[PDB]
């Protein structure tokens, strides 16, 4: 397999539409040995997690939660057994509360819900590097997912600003990262049919941010000179996997993107 | 002048090697009726204004004060009479605490200090846009400050992630401001010998990140086709009035590089 | 005016939709005093000409004619009388044979009829640069136009690769122009309804290349958050007289966008 | 292997330093049969394959030549078999006379020769793609070889232009080569010390030239994260047949940057 020996953590994992499920399957049909981490909902990501090919174990991390971010390194150690360490890092973490997405007005988000989104979304990129390069191989790799947010869009308002704020955040991560002779890197997806995308599409932040993603999900796969399958988060785990093999050795700071090359075409 | 019958806001006023004082007293120069705001010092600021080519109103702002920006308007409106508008708004604010900026290690900032850096510094782009524009007129133009984020660099760290946060801002506000027939776009700038970049080379971040902000400024104006002088906010300050003026008027949520074309230039 | 007492060279006339007439017309309302040059119908140009606000000498420039470029600089000289310089160069010079755009597959463009549009259209910026720099005063600019080619689109084809040709040519351009204190930057317009685009909708380069030019421009005005007239000229005439004023002297190898901010926005 | 089963043409051999030589090695050690293709020199570049992990038949190929592109398709179906069809396609061309880099002035390059460089290293990109992808199969991959040409630099001049024109090219090709389930990309590296890149250093373009070469080397080992060996092209080599594995399905008319991450840092 592409990742045969190696020791990957992978976090964000909530359904079995989290693009962090398909990374984690893609990984293990790979030959990764796989540790999680997942949020709040610790049965069900335990029971969604059953149905990944290998089991894995499982720890909680809340990446608000500075007592979860200092004892993790320990934990994984525990996991993973002492004198192992990670060879991977994936961060598939993202969130932004519905002030800040969706038809409710961009000048309309109060700083609390901001603040709440880029902590989780771009600031937690850097407080899981700084928790786990210690326990990190050179030739390592840690990976985060992106949403391309160099220009603006519909709806995406204030998570588009975490996502700027991401790509700035992997550019310092990946300086520290060298140190350890590890990469950063992000991989730019297109749109994902995630639960939430579904139910957003379906109405859930409002009828125009519904009609606008679906408008803006029709346009990828237009533009996309391969086609873009929103229903297939395949192709984005198989690169997350291509970033955490041997394969891209010289790159770094940098941001691949998965999105059928939509981004390279304006029509 | 360029800004005849213009009335303009303009914030950031705080000495007098503030990016601000330079845009202020060229816009004056340039016929625009200006109205100030200042953070905290207020009395510091007055006597610094004083220095202008006329006088100008000063109104105190702290973008943190949610009751400031909510009488915002009104304070203004009372300034320059009613039935009057602006035609211009210039956000010359930015702030990160130590922490996140000079030799403290890019993973040593916590997300409190990290947080209030990003409020002051993009959050606050879009909270004035949103004070403003309902009592701008058609045609008018918000500016900003950059300083380009595009890649890493050492020291500026977390005030890197805060400026990519802003260009991201900047995008959406865009958005907002053409519904009111406004521009918004930002000014990225050289680096300028204000007192904190002064203080920054005389080792106030600590020795390390004062060499390196010592090779940025050589090798700025190396790369610069038509040099840097870093002692000169001029050239910055009527890039800002070329954008406040009606000469870019098809030009909004976007960025344009007062730096001596050093961006262009890789050596 | 904002040109008043500049001295500024402009090419690129052929008819009255030509967006050159538009930059030599704000000019002259600004008060610049211009020498045009044109390219095989003079008889044509100089009657179109006739309609600018004042009269301007007409020298003849085919770009490809390498006698043509090394008695310009004289030419120049002679109309605007000895001892005086130009303060600005305008290049407003783009071609490219049919089987290099519209329903012509990609594939299927000779070499020497795209070398013959890169030539035109990208090579001889620099044929101009290289020309008038001798006669040109510090402080001094060369603007040209682009249209963003960052990103593939339907048939613009192999003018596309001149444009980004163009955009690396620029880059240079302000290197050498450097040394003689001028700025050299390019103009991204949005598009505009020439004669050529408006016989290009109409079919006249295929069918399915005027759909989508047609797609292109209802896109455009969609995604730019002030809006984009195609019928309009005169915001894309200002931005180049904004280049040539002193009131961007901070900006070089660089592109301004007057394209009512549509490339910051992905819809 | 990382490409068993896979059937390559790898261009661009011509000595044992050639990137397309790595190319060609790593391929092969990861289960690639490759076909390769040469030009002028063919009894060097037999002498110089004769040390490649296996045989591989080499065929004649100037992209200048247009009987060689009308017959390649032809040619490589009788050294692969009928029936059979590549899934992959290196393309490791570049060359610019010596008046379009180095010392000669970027105004002295004349156009033949600017023409010449772009027809080798920019519009034959298209030629070959034109040629072999009729007989690719879905899931293929076309993969081209780029030097970052985003900023100026110094000696590079008009190789730059090739480059940015090349960067063009590609993403038309992505929507040529879409049709046929097939993906386009370069990959953008650092220098590397090939038998011209120590010339050049050595001043074989001029002392100025190789003074600037050598410098751009040693910023770019200090600019990159994971550092830079200018004298190792093998990490170069995996990023190509990373692209041409399975592992990058939804990436094309894309640049990947395998550079030591130094395009993402500013110092
Ligand atoms: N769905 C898309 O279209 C799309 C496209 C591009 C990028 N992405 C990105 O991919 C990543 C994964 O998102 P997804 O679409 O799979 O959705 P998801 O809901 O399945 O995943 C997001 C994860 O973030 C976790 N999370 C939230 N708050 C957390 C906290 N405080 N601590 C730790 N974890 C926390 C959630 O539990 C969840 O597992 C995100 O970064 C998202 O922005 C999504
Ligand atoms: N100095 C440089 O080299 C450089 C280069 C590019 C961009 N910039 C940007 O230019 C802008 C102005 O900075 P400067 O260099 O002139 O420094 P400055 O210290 O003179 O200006 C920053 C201003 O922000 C104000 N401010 C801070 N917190 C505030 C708050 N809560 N509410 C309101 N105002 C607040 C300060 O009072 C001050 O007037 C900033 O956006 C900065 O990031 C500076
Ligand atoms: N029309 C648009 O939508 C649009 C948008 C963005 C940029 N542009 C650019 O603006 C510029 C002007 O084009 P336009 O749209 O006004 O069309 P145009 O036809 O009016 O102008 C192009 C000019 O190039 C001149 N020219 C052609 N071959 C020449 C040669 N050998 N020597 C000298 N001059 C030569 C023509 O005579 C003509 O005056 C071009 O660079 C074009 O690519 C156009
Ligand atoms: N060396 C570097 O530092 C570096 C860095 C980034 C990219 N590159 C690129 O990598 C590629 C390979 O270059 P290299 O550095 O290995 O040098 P090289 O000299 O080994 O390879 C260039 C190849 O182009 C071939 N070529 C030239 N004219 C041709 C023609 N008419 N038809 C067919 N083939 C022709 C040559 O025979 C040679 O094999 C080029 O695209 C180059 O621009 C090089
Ligand atoms: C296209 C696209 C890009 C994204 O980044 C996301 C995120 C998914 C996770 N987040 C989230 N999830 C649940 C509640 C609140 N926030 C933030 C938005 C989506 C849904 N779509
Ligand atoms: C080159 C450059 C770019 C910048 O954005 C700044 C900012 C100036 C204002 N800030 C600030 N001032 C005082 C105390 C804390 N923060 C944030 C940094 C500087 C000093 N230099
Ligand atoms: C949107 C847009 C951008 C452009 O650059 C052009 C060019 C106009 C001048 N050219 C030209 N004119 C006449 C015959 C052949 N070529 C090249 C294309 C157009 C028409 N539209
Ligand atoms: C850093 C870098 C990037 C490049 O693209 C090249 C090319 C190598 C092949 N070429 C070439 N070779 C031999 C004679 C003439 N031209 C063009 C330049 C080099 C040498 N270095």
């Not at 309309?108 to 603040?115: E, G, M, R, T």
């Not at 639960?195 to 109405?203: C, Q």
Request: glycine fraction near 10%.
């Amino acid at each position: 397999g592409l990742l045969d020996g190696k020791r990957i953590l992978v976090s964000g994992i909530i359904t079995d539409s989290s693009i962090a499920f398909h990374i984690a399957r893609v990984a293990q049909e790979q030959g990764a040995q796989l540790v999680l981490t997942g949020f709040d909902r610790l049965r069900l990501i335990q029971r969604i997690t059953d149905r990944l090919p290998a089991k894995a174990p499982l720890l909680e991390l809340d990446v608000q939660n500075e007592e979860h971010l200092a004892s993790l390194a320990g934990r994984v150690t525990e996991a993973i057994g002492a004198g192992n360490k990670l060879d991977g890092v994936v961060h598939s973490i993202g969130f932004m509360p519905q002030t800040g997405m969706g038809i409710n007005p961009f000048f309309d988000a109060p700083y609390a819900d901001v603040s709440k989104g880029i902590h989780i979304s771009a600031y937690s990129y850097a407080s899981m590097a700084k928790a786990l390069l210690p326990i990190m191989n050179p030739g390592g790799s840690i990976v985060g997912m992106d949403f391309d947010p160099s220009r603006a869009m519909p709806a995406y308002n204030w998570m588009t600003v975490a996502k700027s704020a991401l790509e700035s955040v992997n550019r310092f991560v990946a300086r520290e990262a060298g140190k350890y002779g590890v990469r950063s890197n992000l991989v730019a997806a297109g749109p994902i049919r995630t639960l939430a995308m579904s139910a957003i599409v379906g109405g859930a932040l409002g009828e125009e941010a519904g009609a606008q993603i679906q408008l803006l999900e029709e346009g990828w796969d237009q533009r996309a000179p391969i086609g873009w399958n929103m229903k297939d988060a395949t192709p984005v785990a198989k690169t997350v996997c291509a970033l955490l093999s041997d394969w891209l050795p010289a790159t770094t700071g940098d941001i691949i993107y998965a999105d059928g090359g939509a981004h390279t075409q304006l029509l």
